[PDB]
Design an enzyme around this catalytic site. Sequence first.
Site, PDB file in Angstrom:
ATOM      1  N   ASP C   8       1.647  -2.640   0.695  1.00  0.00           N
ATOM      2  CA  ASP C   8       0.484  -1.805   0.850  1.00  0.00           C
ATOM      3  C   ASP C   8       0.970  -0.414   1.155  1.00  0.00           C
ATOM      4  O   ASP C   8       1.689  -0.200   2.128  1.00  0.00           O
ATOM      5  CB  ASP C   8      -0.365  -2.316   1.993  1.00  0.00           C
ATOM      6  N   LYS C  68       0.792  10.599   0.094  1.00  0.00           N
ATOM      7  CA  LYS C  68      -0.029   9.840  -0.844  1.00  0.00           C
ATOM      8  C   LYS C  68      -1.265  10.601  -1.317  1.00  0.00           C
ATOM      9  O   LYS C  68      -2.017  10.110  -2.166  1.00  0.00           O
ATOM     10  CB  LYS C  68      -0.428   8.480  -0.280  1.00  0.00           C
ATOM     11  N   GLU C 145      -6.296  -1.508  -3.190  1.00  0.00           N
ATOM     12  CA  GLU C 145      -6.275  -2.106  -1.897  1.00  0.00           C
ATOM     13  C   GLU C 145      -7.376  -3.129  -1.855  1.00  0.00           C
ATOM     14  O   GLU C 145      -7.128  -4.288  -1.612  1.00  0.00           O
ATOM     15  CB  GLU C 145      -6.491  -1.036  -0.841  1.00  0.00           C
ATOM     16  N   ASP C 167     -13.304  -0.443   4.324  1.00  0.00           N
ATOM     17  CA  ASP C 167     -11.973  -0.312   4.902  1.00  0.00           C
ATOM     18  C   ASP C 167     -12.004   0.937   5.720  1.00  0.00           C
ATOM     19  O   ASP C 167     -12.178   2.002   5.176  1.00  0.00           O
ATOM     20  CB  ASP C 167     -10.892  -0.170   3.805  1.00  0.00           C
TER      21      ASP C 167
END
Lengths: 53, 509, 509, 51
Positions: C8, C68, C145, C167
């Site tokens: 992840d 990211k 994800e 999330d």
Amino acid sequence: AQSLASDLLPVLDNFERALKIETDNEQAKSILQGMEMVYRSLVDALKKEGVEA
Amino acid sequence: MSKIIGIDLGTTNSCVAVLEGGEVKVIPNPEGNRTTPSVVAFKNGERLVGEVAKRQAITNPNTIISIKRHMGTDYKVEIEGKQYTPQEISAIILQYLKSYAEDYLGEPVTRAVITVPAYFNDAQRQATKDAGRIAGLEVERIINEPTAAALAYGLDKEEDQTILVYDLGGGTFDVSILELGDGVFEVKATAGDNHLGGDDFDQVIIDYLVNQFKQEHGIDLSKDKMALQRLKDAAEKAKKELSGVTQTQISLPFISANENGPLHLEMTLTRAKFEELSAHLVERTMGPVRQALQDAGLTPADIDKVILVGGSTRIPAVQEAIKRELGKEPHKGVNPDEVVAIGAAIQGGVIAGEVKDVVLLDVTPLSLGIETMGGVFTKLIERNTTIPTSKSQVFTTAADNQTTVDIHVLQGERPMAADNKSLGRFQLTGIPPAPRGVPQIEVTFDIDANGIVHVRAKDLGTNKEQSITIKSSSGLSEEEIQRMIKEAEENAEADRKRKEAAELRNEAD
Amino acid sequence: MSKIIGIDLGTTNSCVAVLEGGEVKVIPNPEGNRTTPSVVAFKNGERLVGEVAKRQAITNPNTIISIKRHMGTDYKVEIEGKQYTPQEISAIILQYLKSYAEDYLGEPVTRAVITVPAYFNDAQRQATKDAGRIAGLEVERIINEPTAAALAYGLDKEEDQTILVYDLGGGTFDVSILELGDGVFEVKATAGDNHLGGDDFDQVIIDYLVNQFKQEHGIDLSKDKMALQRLKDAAEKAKKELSGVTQTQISLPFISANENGPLHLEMTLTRAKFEELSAHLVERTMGPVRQALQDAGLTPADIDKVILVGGSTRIPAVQEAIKRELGKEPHKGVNPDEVVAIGAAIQGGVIAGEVKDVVLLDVTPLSLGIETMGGVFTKLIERNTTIPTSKSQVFTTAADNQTTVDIHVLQGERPMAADNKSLGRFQLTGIPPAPRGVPQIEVTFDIDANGIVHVRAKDLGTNKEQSITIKSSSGLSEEEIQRMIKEAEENAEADRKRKEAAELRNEAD
Amino acid sequence: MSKIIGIDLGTTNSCVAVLEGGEVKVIPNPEGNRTTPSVVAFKNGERLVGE
């Protein structure tokens, strides 16, 4: 042992913090001539378990 | 048939050792402390003993403290109206020692050896012994601690010679001297004072301290039992410490306080200040030692060597102060507080190791088997075995669809069928048209008491039981065996056998 | 070939899961904490990564952060004359990662899976994939994800239906709405915020404090650095406690001192209150939910189930709002913090080839043993040991010359024969007469995948042997079972069979 | 752990069989007699029974 030594370090720290409190004056410093024993000791305590700083 | 447990029955506290292996260890009592304090008190009509005893001592005025001073004398003691005798008391103590030794072995125990001091007498001796049986421990022997603590170094196997043991108990002190004559101990002199010990050191430390305190800050500490205790202990730990190291620091902060508030007892102490500060215990000691020296007619150089005991004995100044007034370096490493119990157990181990006799049974002096297939010998019962036994093995079809199977049951060593002696040759039929593979057959050799040997031959699935019995007749065991084995030695290269093993060749069907 | 580890890739931190057994452990890194933060630094010729970099962050000019964001771009950054791509940086992170997961395993690891945010575009995904193979990790798929997290709950095998994943990691909240057709997953809508999270949940507390402490002692701790520090700590920790319990103390003695001397912050914080200071965040968090809801032209009714992700979904009110939002209960079954890397590891599982074993009925219902001397029931194979297994124990004989042994196979938990289920009994005969305890006898229990269990008892000097197969050890209602689970304890004191140390009196001399 | 033997007592006579090995064998008197005769006596000193 670790969990303890870990969960100790803040307290064993408050000691370093309290250890130098000295702006001070009186009979109260007797109280603190009380701690630099204990917190010179907790050190030997963890030290048995070989925890240094 | 239990082991023989050694025990050291002391005034101050008592200790219990056993041997298993070539090794002998000290059983611990249910709590920590390999060493158990000897004492007992009663509350519930139920006895309590050992440390858990010292704990509640001050509740129930009924607490028996070192009894072992009263064994062998008319003495009795009242407990809530009822009278007891030392042997009964020391007895219950033992009931504990044995008990928890049983705990430790899971193996109930009885046989025991118990130790008593050099100066003890016949009366007293039958009092401890008495106590022992009373607890239920049959005694194998009773012997005197210093001798027992001679089995540390176990010198009985050494040069006839005269030797001093110097014991400093916890709360006692004693000295002994024994010429070891004809390998044993003529205990030549006893001596030494009955109030002495570590605590008689721990004390001077405690004194020096409190007096120093009242001195500088002005209060007498013995007053509050709190810091009394704190003190005691402190001093003690300080004792053990100064056993090996040359300085130490005691704190006891927050101990007590004046009107400027909290009062912190601190300090650093030396080796010496204590050595000198202990110097009195130091020089008062030896009197018993020397008085004993003439007391047997012996000169200071008349000793061979000098043992040690008495865990408080590990001390700088005791030691330093001994061998010098004496012969060579004090004997070491045996851990004194148990040294004695160690001795016990040793002598016990020995007491079990009595029986050296021997006997018969019978070994089936020559290994038996069946010609196996391929024409080889295959043992079913290895040579020296035993009173009748049994073996069973299987084997199977020779070549495709066998109808019948011989059994040649031969007695010998060598690999090779014909290369041995033989015996009855029987067979089994009833075998069906089953191809080579798994048509299995269980064949056994029973044996019974006197050298009789049955044999069985049975197929598995069809249950066909045809079988013989050998009469042990033809086989020669006079010489013939003790011959044809050495044959196997001369000729052992007979392993050549594997030829027919290789002859697995015709197993190509 | 190598295990395919799910990874992840977090903006903030990234976390890595692999699959042994049938259940998935999650690889811990050198620190001892599960997830390591994605940040990278270089000093000289050395790349450091994760926590240990995030510390020297302030000594370093060069410490790449939250890279990211720029994955999917031409962005470069400059260190040592040298520019770098996201692929290159995040590659480095992946490098440390793989290295430690290797570490746990120890056979090298060549085959990954990587997950990415719900919305990553084509050039993006591609560029991470790149990142990874720069990293030396063959990349056997790339999943987003959410489908991942959903997948570690595996609902992928349930009926065509619709999921809503929510999330909220530490600093940045995301939502996704995913439609499951054909055991296959498609992302129907994306929603989010890149500044809301738990971390800001920490904030409101931290502030509230320095506001109560300015509003009392009028010193602003915010301005003391390490005071900020200890505060942050205490805050987070008090949030944690505050998740399951209705109050907590924050306690920070010696926070600071005035000219008056040492200052002490104490306090008690409610759930109710903290839900005050927080209720706006959560209700910012209903927003994207509804946004994407309309992007799907959709309604709560529509949503079939909901997954929760990220640690701070453990926040009681959060969930509360979700419930009075969709009228439906969140499936929290799995640890919401790693659920993502756990899904990843699952998909690399299927990829590299362990598909789903059903694997049920995997356990002995009850303790299996055989009566031994004095009706004691000796346990052999314990209750709740997984069935396809066997155990073997060596007993010897009762009495000198005992001919025969009678084995009683018993099933229950209870320490006395009487109290157990008698499954079957059989005996074995012929053993050579000879002293007690001397002969070996080997009983083995073997349980097949059915719950059917065979027992064999075989002499070790004979190879003579006998066996039974106990019909079922099943075939009745589990009601009795639980009644015995209970009934075991029910009489706890059957421990009175210690009464058998008495009955250990068999030894006669 | 000594052996355990069977013995039949009566008017006519008695006979004692023990289990050895696989099966049961009888015993051997100081003389023969698979059966020893029901009777006993003495005059002075040691005694004797059987035939």
